[PDB]
Design an enzyme around this catalytic site. Sequence first.
Site, mmCIF file in Angstrom:
data_model
loop_
_atom_site.group_PDB
_atom_site.id
_atom_site.type_symbol
_atom_site.label_atom_id
_atom_site.label_comp_id
_atom_site.label_asym_id
_atom_site.label_seq_id
_atom_site.Cartn_x
_atom_site.Cartn_y
_atom_site.Cartn_z
ATOM 1 N N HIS A 41 -59.889 -13.605 27.340
ATOM 2 C CA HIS A 41 -59.969 -13.058 25.950
ATOM 3 C C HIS A 41 -59.178 -11.549 26.270
ATOM 4 O O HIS A 41 -59.146 -10.932 27.451
ATOM 5 C CB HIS A 41 -61.272 -12.847 25.376
ATOM 6 C CG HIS A 41 -61.896 -11.733 25.908
ATOM 7 N ND1 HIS A 41 -62.772 -11.123 25.010
ATOM 8 C CD2 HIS A 41 -62.260 -11.469 27.394
ATOM 9 C CE1 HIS A 41 -63.667 -10.135 25.807
ATOM 10 N NE2 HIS A 41 -63.176 -10.334 27.217
ATOM 11 N N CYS A 95 -62.067 -4.937 27.852
ATOM 12 C CA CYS A 95 -63.130 -5.572 28.479
ATOM 13 C C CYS A 95 -62.817 -5.513 30.058
ATOM 14 O O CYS A 95 -61.493 -5.420 30.291
ATOM 15 C CB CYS A 95 -63.399 -7.028 28.220
ATOM 16 S SG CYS A 95 -64.574 -7.841 29.095
ATOM 17 N N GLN A 113 -71.590 -14.027 22.497
ATOM 18 C CA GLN A 113 -71.688 -13.681 20.967
ATOM 19 C C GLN A 113 -71.373 -14.849 19.859
ATOM 20 O O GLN A 113 -70.334 -15.548 20.404
ATOM 21 C CB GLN A 113 -70.890 -12.402 20.620
ATOM 22 C CG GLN A 113 -71.533 -11.226 21.323
ATOM 23 C CD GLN A 113 -70.770 -10.033 21.290
ATOM 24 O OE1 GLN A 113 -71.017 -9.003 20.935
ATOM 25 N NE2 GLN A 113 -69.447 -10.004 21.961
ATOM 26 N N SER A 136 -68.555 -6.567 19.842
ATOM 27 C CA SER A 136 -67.765 -5.759 20.688
ATOM 28 C C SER A 136 -66.567 -5.079 20.425
ATOM 29 O O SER A 136 -66.256 -4.018 20.534
ATOM 30 C CB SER A 136 -67.552 -6.518 21.925
ATOM 31 O OG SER A 136 -68.758 -7.453 22.451
ATOM 32 N N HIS A 139 -61.221 -9.575 19.047
ATOM 33 C CA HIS A 139 -60.758 -10.328 20.252
ATOM 34 C C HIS A 139 -59.636 -11.279 19.829
ATOM 35 O O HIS A 139 -59.556 -11.963 19.024
ATOM 36 C CB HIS A 139 -61.849 -11.501 20.877
ATOM 37 C CG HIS A 139 -63.169 -10.722 21.019
ATOM 38 N ND1 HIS A 139 -63.821 -10.454 22.348
ATOM 39 C CD2 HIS A 139 -64.155 -10.385 20.268
ATOM 40 C CE1 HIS A 139 -64.873 -9.912 22.295
ATOM 41 N NE2 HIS A 139 -65.185 -9.655 20.822
HETATM 42 C C1 LIG Z 1 -68.661 -11.304 30.421
HETATM 43 N N1 LIG Z 1 -69.071 -9.989 30.879
HETATM 44 C C2 LIG Z 1 -69.906 -10.168 32.146
HETATM 45 C C3 LIG Z 1 -69.400 -10.501 33.380
HETATM 46 C C4 LIG Z 1 -68.506 -9.574 33.886
HETATM 47 N N2 LIG Z 1 -66.977 -9.712 33.380
HETATM 48 C C5 LIG Z 1 -66.055 -9.611 34.310
HETATM 49 C C6 LIG Z 1 -65.382 -8.426 34.820
HETATM 50 C C7 LIG Z 1 -64.385 -8.169 35.676
HETATM 51 C C8 LIG Z 1 -63.903 -9.657 36.177
HETATM 52 C C9 LIG Z 1 -64.500 -10.637 35.672
HETATM 53 C C10 LIG Z 1 -65.331 -10.871 34.713
HETATM 54 C C11 LIG Z 1 -65.729 -12.286 34.316
HETATM 55 O O1 LIG Z 1 -64.816 -13.213 34.644
HETATM 56 C C12 LIG Z 1 -66.873 -9.689 32.052
HETATM 57 C C13 LIG Z 1 -67.741 -8.966 31.344
#
Ligand SMILES: CN1CCCN(c2ccccc2CO)CC1
EC number: 5.2.1.8
Length: 145
Positions: A41, A95, A113, A136, A139
């Site tokens: 996403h 994100c 969500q 959030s 998306h």
């Molecule tokens: C879904 N959330 C909690 C998990 C951690 N997230 C993430 C952060 C950096 C690299 C990869 C990821 C998941 O692939 C995404 C946020």
Amino acid sequence: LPPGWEKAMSRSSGRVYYFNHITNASQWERPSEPARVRCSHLLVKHSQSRRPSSWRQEKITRTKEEALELINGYIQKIKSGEEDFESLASQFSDCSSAKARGDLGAFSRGQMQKPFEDASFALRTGEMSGPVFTDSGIHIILRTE
Ligand SMILES: CN1CCCN(c2ccccc2CO)CC1
């Protein structure tokens, strides 16, 4: 028609198209459940996001309307081939998954969500959503598996 799809008419052209009210996808051609799906996403946060902060910006100040405009522009560039999803996600997703080209890995129902979950499971493999709204932000979702 597959889950979520309906007929519509173009206002500018008068041509019929198809719209999905779960994913907010829209397309000209007539559209063609697993325990788990895998999605990437691109998130654009706004001032009313649950946490209006990201790795790009300590204080996210843009309005929801402005975030929707940005999402719409990214979708246009992905659909034209001018830019790839993975490239836009790495550069502009609010994100932390931006550092993994937007990849979130695989997940089941009951973990994400609900609007995000519903859109993810209504996408076919390889399909991309339109703008999907959650607490959030807004998306663009790509179902990869
Ligand atoms: C879904 N959330 C909690 C998990 C951690 N997230 C993430 C952060 C950096 C690299 C990869 C990821 C998941 O692939 C995404 C946020």
